[PDB]
């Protein structure tokens, strides 16, 4: 089998200023590649074919070149509707056709802290049997950031779950929500809860904390 | 030049044969020399290949897949199908249906528009409203978000607004997600201050056609938490 | 699409004294509106047609004026069959075609306080878990009232229920109902109930209760 | 000089085809040139156009609403008529069947008696009575109100009378307000001095036909106010 590893993970860049996007093979597969473009809710549409070579219709703004296992795309000038994920193919030995994990192509303003807030189970949950904790981070760029749960000092994991939001066509921000699941009792053994996240626009890491 | 159209089931049960036709327009199936092919995508992840039928009478497959996965064609109503037994809640994804016009070889530059292709088992249930009330004791200088949740729900997708589509600002909602029950789980929330929360009405507006269900909710601050 | 409304929303002329109605039009007509005329529980009778036509059996009371956008309907006098809703038709462009939100006819009558009194729920309905409050506003004019409830000096509102009787063939007044559904656990947990009344007749704003 | 007489089967539920028919007396469907028309009227709203037969064959209706409405006319008995495929709850209205005799235009000159179809809850549940008793903490000084409510019924209207009827002075009833259970509430009320409670004992009758229930409640003073 043949591995696709694409770079960076996240590229957040202006419209208007070049970007390049670097793809590496497990195994040389000479110039044998595509690039395609996916935008959420559509199609992949393809962009380069044979590495080099540009698809039909595509403007001459998007170009391509590598060899072996070193490729690499180049756009001229990006556009408003040009951020989306992009995704490496090789065809160097297939079957299995092997795709990159994607590249995800961010704009600006620049980094802001999350505006954040934890939301204590409500009642008709509680009678039921269940209890949820929420952490919400909202207006926060980039989209990185990392949750943790502690109640009252116990180590947890599995426990949790997270989810993102898209970049806002306004604010250009994101928004994360993190639920921790429990039982009715289960969540009245212990008292305290807290939710703790580390972001790049956060000096320090913010703890937030509520009572039982 | 050719237009392709999926379509399929849509709700399977696991364990039975997920079935897919693409249909081809704006010309036959065998039109030239080119290849025929079929793509899957897991929602928030990238896309998979499952197999791809050659002009000649050569068909190829994943070698993960092919135990399970037929792919055949017919000229006589000019179209070709996909076949998967024994499919699992992991097959839940979106299907193309794709060709390679020009030039013989293994990329795809012809697509046709996807299919959501759910297997969870779950008898389409009707939606459950949860009003995310705010809280004054959580509130940060004046501004709060409330919100509404729509819970243990079946199939998609759920129709979720604000005063009937009236309040539109700030409002931001949630793609739904799978539960280990079989069940989704969305979230429609908006910030706003809570001076204005005590003479400007919040309904969550909750239609879900498939169970033909309609519910309206008021979200308002719990008064066992009130500021009394 | 093209859209018009009327004015004004409600109009109180005595019997017996001219009166006038207004109809505008988003975008110019020339003359191509009409005048209906609508009692309850009656279908809609035909008024004026293309303005300043008066159609088959209709007496010269009713006069219709006005072009391009702006169009009026004067009565000499009004007799007492008078009392209706009267709407007003385009045929400038349809299909669609697009109606007036309707205008009432009102008889003049002297500005009268409420007789405000609440039922509190009783028993019968409490055994059902809900509970279901009533306000009575008797024998006031003019219709208009503004109707709030009041719990534990906290407002609740968008949960209730309002009528409007007709009105009255004696003495002209209006009867209002306004009806509060609650749940078992709130009604529980709450121990005064109110409704506040606003109204013409009423020197300041009037809330009657009772405690749980 | 042409009348117009509506029929259908006024109740229904969400999803099936509401049909209407209007026929003509007096006068023919290929009558002169004119137009023949169906619009409707939500209980307590205004009138809503729903289409109109143009005497040549030509049909018009509300773009809105022409996906799912149909006109269609014959002559052999002589009449027109409404089909609205997967009716909803939301289409509860009272319909007219109307035409234009002079001249022809968009107006209409001819009516007939339009009828209310309902399209949520069910023929077969009888009311029950639920007692308005006055108490001495709710007389004002001489001033009582008693009473009877008509609850957990349909379909409306329902017959309500005090003593068999022999009490009509001072009898004051309500219009039915459809609740968000499918069912009707109405009020029957009697205002008088608080000294009437104990010289004449009160009977609330409520006789049902469509479920055939009739129930005779006595209103008595409250039992709450003895010393338990």
């Known amino acids: 089998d043949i591995q696709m590893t694409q770079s960076p993970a996240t590229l957040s860049l202006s419209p208007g200023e070049r970007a390049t996007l670097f793809c590496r093979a497990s195994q040389s597969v000479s110039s044998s590649l595509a690039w395609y473009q996916q935008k959420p809710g559509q199609a992949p549409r393809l962009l380069i074919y044979?590495?080099?070579n540009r698809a039909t219709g595509i403007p001459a703004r998007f170009s391509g070149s590598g060899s072996g296992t070193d490729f690499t795309l180049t756009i001229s000038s990006l556009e408003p509707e040009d951020f989306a994920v992009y995704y490496c193919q090789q065809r160097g030995n297939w079957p299995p056709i092997t795709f990159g994990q994607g590249t995800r192509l961010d704009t600006k303003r620049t980094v802001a802290a999350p505006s954040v807030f934890i939301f204590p189970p409500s009642d008709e949950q509680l009678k039921s049997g269940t209890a949820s904790v929420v952490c919400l981070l909202n207006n926060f760029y980039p989209r990185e950031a990392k949750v943790q749960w502690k109640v009252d000092n116990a180590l947890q994991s599995g426990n949790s779950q997270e989810s993102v939001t898209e970049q806002d066509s306004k604010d250009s921000t994101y928004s994360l929500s993190s639920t921790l699941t429990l039982s009715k009792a289960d969540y009245e053994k212990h008292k305290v809860y807290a939710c703790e996240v580390t972001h790049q626009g956060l000096s320090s890491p913010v703890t937030k904390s509520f009572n039982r | 030049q050719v237009q392709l159209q999926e379509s399929g089931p849509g709700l399977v049960k696991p364990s039975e044969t997920l079935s897919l036709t693409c249909t081809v327009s704006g010309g036959s199936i065998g039109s030239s020399s080119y290849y025929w092919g079929w793509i899957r995508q897991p929602p928030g992840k990238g896309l998979q290949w499952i197999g791809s039928?050659?002009?000649?009478?050569?068909?190829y497959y994943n070698p993960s897949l092919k135990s399970r996965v037929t792919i055949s064609v017919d000229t006589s109503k000019n179209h070709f199908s996909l076949k998967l037994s024994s499919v699992t809640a992991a097959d839940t994804a979106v299907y193309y249906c794709a060709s390679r016009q020009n030039w013989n070889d293994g990329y795809f530059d012809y697509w046709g528009q996807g299919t959501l292709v759910t297997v969870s088992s779950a008898s389409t249930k009707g939606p459950s409203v949860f009003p995310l009330a705010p809280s004054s004791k959580s509130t940060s200088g004046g501004t709060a978000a409330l919100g509404c949740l729509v819970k243990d729900y079946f199939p998609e997708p759920v129709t979720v607004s604000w005063n009937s589509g009236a309040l539109t600002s700030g409002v931001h909602t949630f793609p739904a997600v799978l539960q280990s029950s079989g069940l989704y789980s969305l979230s429609s929330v908006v910030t706003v201050p809570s001076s204005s929360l005590g003479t400007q009405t919040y309904i969550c507006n909750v239609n879900h056609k498939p169970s033909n269900t309609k519910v309206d909710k008021r979200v308002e601050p719990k008064s066992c938490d009130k500021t009394h | 699409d093209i859209q018009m409304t009327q004015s004004p929303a409600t109009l109180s002329l005595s019997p017996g004294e001219r009166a006038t109605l207004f109809c505008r039009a988003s975008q110019s007509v020339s003359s191509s509106l009409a005048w209906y005329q609508q009692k309850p529980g009656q279908a809609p009778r035909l008024?004026?047609?293309?303005?300043?036509?008066?159609?088959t059996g209709i007496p010269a009371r009713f006069s219709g004026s006005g072009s391009g956008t702006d169009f009026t309907l004067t009565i000499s006098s009004l007799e007492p069959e008078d009392f209706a809703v009267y709407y007003c038709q385009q045929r400038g462009n349809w299909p669609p075609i697009t109606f007036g939100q309707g205008t009432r006819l009102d008889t003049k009558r002297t500005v009268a306080a409420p007789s405000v009194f609440i039922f509190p729920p009783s028993d019968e309905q409490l055994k059902s878990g809900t509970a279901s409050v009533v306000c009575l506003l008797n024998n006031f004019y003019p219709r208009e009232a503004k109707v709030q409830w009041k719990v534990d000096n906290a407002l609740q509102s968008g949960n209730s229920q309002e009528s409007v009787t007709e009105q009255d063939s004696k003495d002209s007044t209006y009867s209002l109902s306004s009806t509060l559904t609650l749940s078992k656990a709130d009604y529980e947990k709450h121990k005064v109930y109110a409704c506040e009344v606003t109204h013409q007749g009423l020197s300041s704003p009037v809330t009657k209760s009772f405690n749980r | 000089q042409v009348q117009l007489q509506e029929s259908g089967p006024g109740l229904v539920k969400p999803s099936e085809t509401l049909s209407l028919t209007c026929t003509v007396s007096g006068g023919s469907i290929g009558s002169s040139s004119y137009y023949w028309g169906w619009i409707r009227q939500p209980p307590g709203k205004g009138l809503q156009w729903?289409?109109?037969?143009?005497?040549?064959?030509?049909?018009?209706?509300?773009p809105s609403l022409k996906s799912r409405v149909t006109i269609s006319v014959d002559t052999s008995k002589n009449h027109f008529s409404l089909k609205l495929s997967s009716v909803t709850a939301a289409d509860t209205a009272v319909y007219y069947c109307a035409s234009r005799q002079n001249w022809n235009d968009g107006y209409f000159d001819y009516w007939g008696q339009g009828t209310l179809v309902t399209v949520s809850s069910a023929s077969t549940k009888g009311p029950s009575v639920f007692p308005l008793a006055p108490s001495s903490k709710s007389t004002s000084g001489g001033t009582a109100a008693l009473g009877c409510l008509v609850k957990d019924y349909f379909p409306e209207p329902v017959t309500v009378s005090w003593n068999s009827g022999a009490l009509t002075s001072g009898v004051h009833t309500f219009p039915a307000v459809l609740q968000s259970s499918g069912l009707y509430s109405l009020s029957s009320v009697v205002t008088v001095p608080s000294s009437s409670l104990g010289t004449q004992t009160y009977i609330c009758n409520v006789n049902h036909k469509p479920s055939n229930t009739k129930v005779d409640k006595r209103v008595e003073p409250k039992s709450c106010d003895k010393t338990h």
């Open positions: 044979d590495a080099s």
């Open positions: 039928f050659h002009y000649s009478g050569t068909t």
